[PDB]
Amino acid sequence: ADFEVHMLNKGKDGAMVFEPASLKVAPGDTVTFIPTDKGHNVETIKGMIPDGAEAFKSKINENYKVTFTAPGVYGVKCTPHYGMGMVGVVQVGDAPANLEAVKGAKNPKKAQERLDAALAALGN
Template identity: 35%
Template sequence: MPDDHTFEPKTATIETGGTVTWTNESDVQHTVTAYEDEIPAEAVYFASGGFESERAARNRVTEGLIAPGENYEHTFDQPGTYGYCCIPHESSGMVGTVRVR
């Protein structure tokens, strides 16, 4: 049985200009929220809910929730490493990485 509090894969590697789609395959709501200090300086911030900063995403977490069966996608135009989490389940270790080549 899959763990409802993990990203699969935990680390994804894509090419510059590629899009990652996160699909919620669990029975609970999740977010995809970039850590501002773990993305390349020139990269566009990303978070489910369309927030422009990590603080906004954390302050308005319910607006960024992805319901079971729904998805969120982001296109990565800058190479580098991007760290992100699910805010409600961050303390359970629900974190991930996207590496863009």
């Protein structure tokens, strides 16, 4: 299955957001991250990807398609706007084994506030 996530300067949840900020997909599904506004990218957050997965980092302004392989929870950020809280979470499959490890990862305050909300929206 294929999904879309947009990067915007302003959304319902405030400035510098991924929409949706929380998404559950199946193993093998693809998500395209699309900078609707210019100046954004997507990168995995350190400490917030499952075992067996490889980190990724897109270029500024490109539409970046990723096929998620290893099951678990992935935290993503926009590189320039991580400190402003521009983050999101993608859960791949049921019963993510690294859910408890990702809740403990360290992030700047505004990002953590939004990651905690996004993790709670997954019923986590």
